[PDB]
């Protein structure tokens, strides 16, 4: 009866690929660009809003950058709703780890939980996978500052600097050309902004199409989500714009 209508989302191609995984990766490539850069004294996240309109309240708008806990943030590329579902589950897992061990959750543990959720969705249930790619930026007392990435395939990796979404190839090439192991957080901000301005498909980079975040260091980390005026100031300061 209902067999005729099953897309069978979790089956292998003759080559050995997952159809829905590749198609979701394509859909994400068609989404906004997000860039994470890890420095010796902090981590920086930048993202381009694809939703662009002069009547869009950019103040109460967070479509690319979300907070998991107080030590971990995520940059999103793809369907925002699936992203928020996974972010809610991730926050719940972080708080459960906290309640269990009375210590903040290590970043890789949360990343692996989310990646295993994705993989389970790419192996059983006959449901569509999550069309979302995540860039995690966090700090733990074990590995210090950490930058991870995960895709709908359920695979996750680590990076010094990484990009997801659209035009990731040119962004990665530029980052590898301009990255240095001893750079600071302001250098990371400059590099992320230059890469976004050089790999943008719009006229020019402006504050109304940007989301920015910095995890900095006292023995306490500061998770600063940039506001529109702060974004405009950091744009005009780094030389991308002038006013």
């Amino acid at each position: 009866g209902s067999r005729r209508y099953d897309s069978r989302t979790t089956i292998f191609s003759p080559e050995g690929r997952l159809y829905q995984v590749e198609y979701a990766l394509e859909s994400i490539s068609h989404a906004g660009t997000a860039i994470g850069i890890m420095a010796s004294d902090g981590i920086v996240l930048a993202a381009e809003r694809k939703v662009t309109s002069t009547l869009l309240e950019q103040d109460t708008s967070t479509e690319k950058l979300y907070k998991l806990n107080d030590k971990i943030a995520v940059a999103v590329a793809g369907l925002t709703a699936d992203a928020e579902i996974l972010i809610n589950t991730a926050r719940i897992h972080a708080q459960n780890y906290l309640k269990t061990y009375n210590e903040d959750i290590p970043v890789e543990i949360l990343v692996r939980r989310l990646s295993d959720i994705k993989q389970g969705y790419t192996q059983h249930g006959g449901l569509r996978p999550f069309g979302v790619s995540f860039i995690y930026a966090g700090y733990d007392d074990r590995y210090g500052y950490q930058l991870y990435t995960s895709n709908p395939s359920g695979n996750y990796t680590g990076w010094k600097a990484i990009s997801v979404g659209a035009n990731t190839s040119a962004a990665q090439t530029l980052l590898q050309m301009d990255y240095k192991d001893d750079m600071k957080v302001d250098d990371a901000i400059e590099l992320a902004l230059k890469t976004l301005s050089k790999t943008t498909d719009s006229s020019a980079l402006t504050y109304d199409r940007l989301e920015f975040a910095t995890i900095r260091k006292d023995g306490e980390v500061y998770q600063k989500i940039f506001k529109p005026q702060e974004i405009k100031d950091i744009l005009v300061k780094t030389g991308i714009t002038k006013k």
Binding site: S2, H30, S53, T54, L56, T80, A81, E84, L127
Partner: protein, 249 residues
């Protein structure tokens, strides 16, 4: 037996969720609705496209109340919007008020309804909702807010926007007419103008619905004696008030 346990919304090779795009298309063919946020209130408005003149248009409401401080309007398929408003009211009561004793803020209610709609695009044996929603709400710590929710489960905060048939022209007119210093009556006037643009037939208090999230109306509370309990901020305008404001368009 619901053997449809598999996803009905999958990714096409072009990186497209077909059912989501088709729901958005069905939304585009829906009657025009709009919302405008002012400095002291928000306004939502839409056209009352009746099926037959024998049918009583007041019995069917396109503008519905979610919470005493949060109202909603839509564009697309009526029945989906009706079941969605029912689910939204029940979720606002369960997942918040029965826990904190207060009604949820606008952003959280919008997030709950967006989760509901997202589940339609991934769960088994179901199609996405064929509606787009404009939710106008007010909470104490965020003030007034206007949000738009699409069938994809995504939501956006808008200073002012519109959805439906004349969506593009309406949005352009609102971009050309809106500013960050409008009062509630100015927003009502701009909404009436945009609707008069996006309508061809009659335009009177009996053919359009319009509601406001403005000040508290204690006369609509139904009980006195609690100073901390003020009236609701959501109020649908009567046909008389609509016609009075139309007489000065």
């Amino acid at each position: 037996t619901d053997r449809y346990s598999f996803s009905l919304t999958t990714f096409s090779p072009s990186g497209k969720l077909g059912q989501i795009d088709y729901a958005l298309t069905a939304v585009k063919q829906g009657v025009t609705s709009l919302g405008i946020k002012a400095t002291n209130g928000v306004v939502i408005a839409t056209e009352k496209k009746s099926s037959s003149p024998l049918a009583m248009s007041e019995t069917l409401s396109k503008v519905s109340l979610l919470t005493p401080d949060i109202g909603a309007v839509y564009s697309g398929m009526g029945p989906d919007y009706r079941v969605l408003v029912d689910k939204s009211r029940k979720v606002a009561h369960t997942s918040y008020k029965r826990i904190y004793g207060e009604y949820p803020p606008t952003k959280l209610l919008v997030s709950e309804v967006a989760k509901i709609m997202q589940e339609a695009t991934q769960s088994g044996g179901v199609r996405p909702f064929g509606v787009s929603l404009l939710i106008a709400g007010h909470d104490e710590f965020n003030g007034f807010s206007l949000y738009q929710v699409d069938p994809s489960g995504s939501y956006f905060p808008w200073k002012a926007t519109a959805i439906g048939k004349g969506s593009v022209a309406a949005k352009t007119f609102l971009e050309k007419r809106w500013n960050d210093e409008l009062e509630l009556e100015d927003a009502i006037h701009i909404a009436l103008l945009t609707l008069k643009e996006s309508v061809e037939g009659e335009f009177n208090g009996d053919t359009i619905e319009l509601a406001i999230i403005g000040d508290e109306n204690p006369d609509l509370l139904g009980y006195t004696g609690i100073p901390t309990d003020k009236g609701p901020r959501f109020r649908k305008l009567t046909s008389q008030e609509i016609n009075d404001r139309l007489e000065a368009l």
